[PDB]
Every structure is written in structure tokens, then in C-alpha cells.
Design an enzyme around this catalytic site. Structure first.
Site, mmCIF file in Angstrom:
data_model
loop_
_atom_site.group_PDB
_atom_site.id
_atom_site.type_symbol
_atom_site.label_atom_id
_atom_site.label_comp_id
_atom_site.label_asym_id
_atom_site.label_seq_id
_atom_site.Cartn_x
_atom_site.Cartn_y
_atom_site.Cartn_z
ATOM 1 N N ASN A 20 -5.329 -11.328 20.020
ATOM 2 C CA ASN A 20 -5.379 -12.722 20.475
ATOM 3 C C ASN A 20 -4.053 -13.278 20.993
ATOM 4 O O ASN A 20 -4.003 -14.456 21.378
ATOM 5 C CB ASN A 20 -5.990 -13.653 19.426
ATOM 6 C CG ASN A 20 -5.106 -13.869 18.229
ATOM 7 O OD1 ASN A 20 -3.983 -13.396 18.165
ATOM 8 N ND2 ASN A 20 -5.630 -14.573 17.245
ATOM 9 N N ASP A 95 -6.279 -2.773 -0.085
ATOM 10 C CA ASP A 95 -5.112 -2.768 -0.968
ATOM 11 C C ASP A 95 -5.352 -3.753 -2.113
ATOM 12 O O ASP A 95 -5.499 -4.953 -1.868
ATOM 13 C CB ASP A 95 -3.863 -3.160 -0.160
ATOM 14 C CG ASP A 95 -2.634 -2.348 -0.536
ATOM 15 O OD1 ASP A 95 -2.311 -2.275 -1.737
ATOM 16 O OD2 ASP A 95 -1.991 -1.759 0.387
ATOM 17 N N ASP A 197 -1.732 -1.120 -5.660
ATOM 18 C CA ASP A 197 -0.302 -1.385 -5.554
ATOM 19 C C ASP A 197 0.377 -1.420 -6.916
ATOM 20 O O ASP A 197 -0.112 -2.086 -7.838
ATOM 21 C CB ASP A 197 -0.203 -2.741 -4.850
ATOM 22 C CG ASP A 197 1.209 -3.131 -4.547
ATOM 23 O OD1 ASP A 197 1.762 -2.589 -3.554
ATOM 24 O OD2 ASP A 197 1.779 -4.002 -5.270
ATOM 25 N N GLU A 253 -0.848 3.576 -6.348
ATOM 26 C CA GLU A 253 0.592 3.671 -6.025
ATOM 27 C C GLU A 253 1.290 3.737 -7.384
ATOM 28 O O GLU A 253 1.509 2.724 -8.064
ATOM 29 C CB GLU A 253 1.080 2.465 -5.232
ATOM 30 C CG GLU A 253 2.555 2.615 -4.823
ATOM 31 C CD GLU A 253 3.233 1.330 -4.322
ATOM 32 O OE1 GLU A 253 2.881 0.216 -4.765
ATOM 33 O OE2 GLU A 253 4.151 1.469 -3.477
ATOM 34 N N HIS A 329 4.097 2.359 4.986
ATOM 35 C CA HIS A 329 4.758 1.130 5.405
ATOM 36 C C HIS A 329 6.044 0.839 4.635
ATOM 37 O O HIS A 329 6.731 -0.139 4.953
ATOM 38 C CB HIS A 329 3.787 -0.034 5.226
ATOM 39 C CG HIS A 329 3.445 -0.275 3.801
ATOM 40 N ND1 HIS A 329 2.760 0.663 3.051
ATOM 41 C CD2 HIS A 329 3.786 -1.289 2.973
ATOM 42 C CE1 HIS A 329 2.655 0.190 1.820
ATOM 43 N NE2 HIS A 329 3.274 -0.981 1.744
ATOM 44 N N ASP A 330 6.392 1.688 3.675
ATOM 45 C CA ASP A 330 7.565 1.565 2.862
ATOM 46 C C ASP A 330 8.591 2.668 3.104
ATOM 47 O O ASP A 330 9.622 2.711 2.408
ATOM 48 C CB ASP A 330 7.208 1.622 1.366
ATOM 49 C CG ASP A 330 6.424 0.437 0.874
ATOM 50 O OD1 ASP A 330 6.544 -0.655 1.455
ATOM 51 O OD2 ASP A 330 5.714 0.617 -0.142
HETATM 52 CA CA LIG Z 1 -2.988 -11.868 16.683
#
Ligand SMILES: [Ca+2]
Length: 559
Positions: A20, A95, A197, A253, A329-330
Site C-alpha cells: 500500500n 510468533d 519467543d 526459541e 531476523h536476529d
Molecule cells: Ca504498507
């Protein structure tokens, strides 16, 4: 046990696809890219958290478990995503972030008001010491103390992560029930499982003992921060009350996990989780316990990697189940962290993939790993991550345990933001991630590294990953075979054998830029091999002796 045979693709949705135009990846963007993921061949998606959150830790600080953060979309978009995943024969894992909430969660906004509030005991409040200081010397993962004072009520609350991430009180049965209700809400609406997590932290040592110290630091992160006395009790309860009622997958995790802890989480007879992420293989390139933590860098040591991954392969060979990952992502991009991300980038990316995907367990592909995304050259002022900002202040400015130059070097290797710059779809503006302005800049190398060019190049990293996934679906040995490390002392070559029902799979990977030699051990010298995959074009099947080129990787199956 479809989760044993799965390949999981991890999406970091704020950085995946912005449909968007506001520069922030969204759920409709994920929907529009599902065909890409299916063509790669992953059959499970793990979505990093999209729940309502003020974004202090980019979604890991949740302020409403039953609604989406507005920039991702609404619950209607999330329900469409679930349906779209299922229409493609795929599964979706969400998650579960239930060690802590945002301090803007209604529960905490109430808890902090007064000792008599009904939410007071949803969190972990303690009196100051007589001198007004914190209840003990425990530290936050994101620097400083694990305790923050509330002036209105005269007590500190606990947070292992940021001060905007107060830890939940799992000793309170009402908190556990709230968590189970969240899980059922989403599983009843088609969520196929959970990535949990910091599941290792949910049980506290409720005497809150101080750590011992040698005076290298004021606040300490250590063994009390995971593996608490009620941890496995709580997970067993969660399985009885929730997980046992659904056809689901769970991956914890597991901060603080070693191989014995992994057996507690993953032995099927214990009715806990299916698999865990450990950090032990990600920990090989830091000092054991510097005040600078993971920023106290060591060079890549292949022997350390082989020892650690072999301990995990053998420890969970006949009980439990492994996860297989080098990126998330870590973590930084593995080819930049430990390999060559320039002239040998393709060979190196394919080499790390072969080492990983030839092992027993469930592989995880982090978005962009499959095209060889790399670390960023952006200056420090462009980073977003609170972990970096807080460590700069503590280690460089205040305590002076790292120089500026050393800290910058460490961040350029290991900063979490190397994983979080937007997915690189094509060579146009912002790599095709957005028509607007991205929330963090696209990595400056995107014109050379992107999905468009990968799909045009038969020698791409992408098609190599696609082939590794296909092979896993074709060759049951890759899923169910045992594991034996070969040529264990070799400082360049990571070689191992899988065996299953009289068949053998040989994996030989030169994780170095120099020539190397693999020689099969005596018991294997009269095997005949069919090569299943290789990252160089020269083709011969006499795998008993291989003169390996830089980053050369090969897998063969016995015939
Ligand atoms: Ca967006």
C-alpha cells in the site's frame, strides 16, 4: 509429523512487501508474494509478530494479542492470509510472545496503577533494596538493569528485554489461562503452530537471587535468565491444555539451551514442543562471557562450528528433533558474517546451504537467504534496532568497555538490522519493495542481488535452494537418516554421512576460499555414488577423493 518433513520460510513482514505504499511491509503484501514462496518450495511460513504493538522491539512488545498492528492490516487481512496459505497447500506458524508484553498492553497499564488492581500480579513487582536500588543485580538483554522503578507504587517491575517489555508472571494461573486463550483464539481460526519467543525465560527463580560477580560489570545476564524451576512444568501444561488439541507444529526459541535441555523440550514422550532453536552454533563467534557480550567478536572457526553442530546432530539423533538455521531476523547474513560475499558469493551461499540442508532436522530459510542477501554498508546513524542504540550508550559512552571503532566494526558484522533491510525483489527503485519511502533503506547492493535477476539466472542461489528443497522431498534419507561427522580434524572441509535403510548420503563442503582435499574413510572407498547437487559445473562421481575448489559443495547418494 509433517513438521519433520517441512521446510520453513521465515517472513519478517515489515520488510517483506509493501503493497500500500507507506514503506512498511503488510499482510496483503505477504499474500501477493505467496506464489513466490511456494515456487521456492517451502511448505510452512513462520511470520514474525504482526499483533498490535508500539514497535519498541518491532512487534516483540505486544499490546493486544487478538488484533493486528494497523500498518500490517486488520484481523480480516490476517484471516485472508491464513486462507491463502491453506489454499496453496501450505501451513502458517505465528510468533507466540508470552514471556513479556508491551508496557502499553492494557494488562500492564492496569497492573502499574496500584497494588490492589486485579492485574497487579500479572507482572513481577518487587520492593527496592533499603537504599532504593534494584531488587538484585540482574541485567536486561538490551543493556542496563532488568528492573524499572514505578514511582506511583514504590516498586520495581522486571523486564528481561526493554523497559517497554515487562515480563509476565507465569506463577499466576490467570496469566497462564490468558495465554492459552490467545493460543486457542488463533488456532481455532486456522493458525497451524507457534514459534515461541524466549520460551526458555517464562519460569523465574522467584527468590530472585543475585548473581556472583567479578566486578567486570554492574548488571549480569546469566543462568537465572533461562531454564527456571517450573519451565518444563509450564510447557507440559500448555501442551495438555492447548497443543494436544490441534494438529500443530511448535518451535521454541530456547534461549539458554544446551543439548540436554533440548531433549527436555523435544523428546516426544515428554509432551512439550516439537523442536527448538538453540543459540549454541550462533555463539561460536563471541567470547564466552565478555561484558560486551555478542559484540566481543571472534573470527569464524570452522572447527567450532563442526563440533557444535555435530553435538546437536548426535544428541538429538534418536530422540527429539533439530531445527536447522543460519539466518533469522536476529542474525546477520551468514555469507557476510562467516564467508565471502563478493566474488565467491554464489558459491559461498550455496556451500552454507548445503552444509545445513544435508543435516537431520527441519530447515529454516530466512527471507532473502535464498538469493544471497548480504550485510549492509550503511553508517551507524541509519540503524534502527534498540539493541544497538542501547549497547552503544552502555558499552561505548558510559562504561567504555568498547571503543567507538571496535563497536562499529562489531555492528557491521552482527547487527540485527542486516536481516531487516527490505527484501530485494528487483533492480528498480527500493528494489521493488515499495512505491513510497521504505521504513529503513534497502541495502545498497540490491541492483545486483534480487529476485528478478535470480529467476533469470539458472546458476542462481535461488535455484540451488529450490533444488535442495526438492531433494529433501524426494530422498527420505535427508529427513530420517542418522549422522556421522567425517574427516573431523580438517580445518577447511565440513563433511558428514547420513545413513538410512542401507543407503548413504555423503555431504562434502569446503568452507574456505582455498583449495582443499576430501578423502573418504576406508569403510567408504568401494561405494558408488550418484551426485545429487554441486555448486560447480565440473561433474565426476568418484567421491572417494575430491580436490575441492573454493567453497565447493557436493552431495552424493550411494547406488
Ligand atoms: Ca504498507
Amino acid at each position: 509429523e509433517w513438521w519433520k518433513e517441512a521446510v520453513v520460510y521465515q517472513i519478517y513482514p515489515r520488510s517483506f512487501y509493501d503493497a500500500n505504499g507507506d514503506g512498511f511491509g503488510d499482510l496483503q503484501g505477504v499474500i501477493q508474494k505467496l506464489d513466490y514462496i511456494k515456487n521456492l518450495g517451502a511448505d510452512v511460513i513462520w511470520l514474525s509478530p504482526v499483533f498490535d504493538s508500539p514497535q519498541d522491539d518491532n512487534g516483540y512488545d505486544i499490546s493486544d494479542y487478538k488484533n493486528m498492528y494497523e500498518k500490517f492490516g486488520t484481523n480480516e487481512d490476517m484471516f485472508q492470509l491464513i486462507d491463502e496459505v491453506h489454499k496453496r497447500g501450505m501451513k502458517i506458524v505465528m510468533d507466540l510472545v508470552v514471556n513479556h508484553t508491551s508496557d502499553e498492553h492494557a494488562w500492564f497499564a492496569e497492573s502499574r496503577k496500584s497494588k490492589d488492581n486485579p492485574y497487579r500480579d500479572y507482572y513481577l513487582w518487587k520492593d527496592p533494596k533499603p537504599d532504593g536500588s534494584e531488587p538484585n543485580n540482574w541485567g536486561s538483554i538490551f543493556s542496563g538493569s532488568a528492573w524499572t522503578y514505578d514511582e506511583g507504587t514504590g516498586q520495581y517491575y522486571l523486564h528481561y528485554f526493554s523497559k517497554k517489555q515487562p515480563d509476565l508472571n507465569w506463577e499466576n494461573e490467570a496469566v497462564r489461562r490468558e495465554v492459552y486463550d490467545v493460543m486457542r483464539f488463533w488456532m481455532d481460526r486456522g493458525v497451524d503452530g507457534w514459534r515461541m519467543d524466549v520460551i526458555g525465560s517464562i519460569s523465574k527463580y522467584t527468590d530472585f537471587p543475585d548473581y556472583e560477580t567479578d566486578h567486570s560489570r554492574s548488571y549480569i545476564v546469566g543462568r537465572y535468565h533461562s531454564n527456571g524451576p517450573r519451565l518444563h512444568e509450564f510447557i507440559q501444561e500448555m501442551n495438555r491444555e492447548v497443543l494436544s488439541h490441534y494438529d500443530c507444529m511448535t518451535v521454541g526459541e530456547a534461549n539458554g539451551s544446551d543439548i540436554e535441555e533440548a531433549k527436555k523440550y523435544t523428546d516426544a514422550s515428554r509432551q512439550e514442543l516439537n523442536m527448538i532453536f538453540t543459540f549454541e552454533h550462533m555463539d561460536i563467534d563471541k567470547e564466552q562471557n565478555s561484558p560486551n557480550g555478542k559484540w566481543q567478536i571472534k573470527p569464524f572457526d570452522l572447527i567450532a562450528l563442526k563440533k557444535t553442530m555435530t553435538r546437536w546432530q548426535t544428541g538429538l539423533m534418536n530422540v527429539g528433533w533439530n531445527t536447522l538455521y543460519f539466518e533469522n531476523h536476529d542474525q546477520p547474513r551468514v555469507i557476510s558474517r562467516w564467508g565471502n560475499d563478493r566474488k565467491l558469493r554464489k558459491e559461498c551461499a550455496k556451500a552454507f546451504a548445503t552444509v545445513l540442508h544435508g543435516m537431520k532436522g527441519t530447515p529454516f530459510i530466512y527471507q532473502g537467504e535464498e538469493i544471497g542477501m548480504v550485510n549492509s554498508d550503511m553508517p551507524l546513524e541509519m540503524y534502527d534496532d534498540l539493541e544497538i542504540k542501547n549497547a552503544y550508550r552502555e558499552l561505548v559512552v558510559e562504561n567504555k568497555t568498547m571503543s567507538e571503532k571496535e563497536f562499529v566494526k562489531a555492528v557491521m558484522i552482527k547487527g540485527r538490522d542486516h536481516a531487516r533491510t527490505p527484501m530485494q525483489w528487483d533492480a528498480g527503485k527500493h528494489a521493488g519493495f515499495t512505491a513510497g519511502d521504505p521504513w529503513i533503506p534497502v541495502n545498497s547492493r540490491y541492483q545486483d542481488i534480487n529476485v528478478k535477476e535470480s529467476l533469470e539466472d539458472q546458476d542462481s542461489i535461488f535455484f540451488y535452494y529450490q533444488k535442495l528443497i526438492q531433494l529433501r522431498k524426494q530422498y527420505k534419507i535427508m529427513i530420517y537418516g542418522d549422522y556421522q561427522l567425517l574427516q573431523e580434524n580438517d580445518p577447511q572441509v565440513f563433511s558428514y554421512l547420513r545413513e538410512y535403510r542401507g543407503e548413504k548420503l555423503l555431504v562434502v563442503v569446503n568452507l574456505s576460499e582455498e583449495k582443499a582435499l576430501f578423502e573418504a574413510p576406508p569403510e567408504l572407498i568401494h561405494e558408488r555414488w550418484k551426485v545429487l547437487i554441486r555448486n560447480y559445473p565440473q561433474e565426476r562421481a568418484d567421491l572417494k577423493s575430491i580436490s575441492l575448489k573454493p567453497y565447493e559443495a557436493v552431495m552424493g547418494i550411494s547406488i
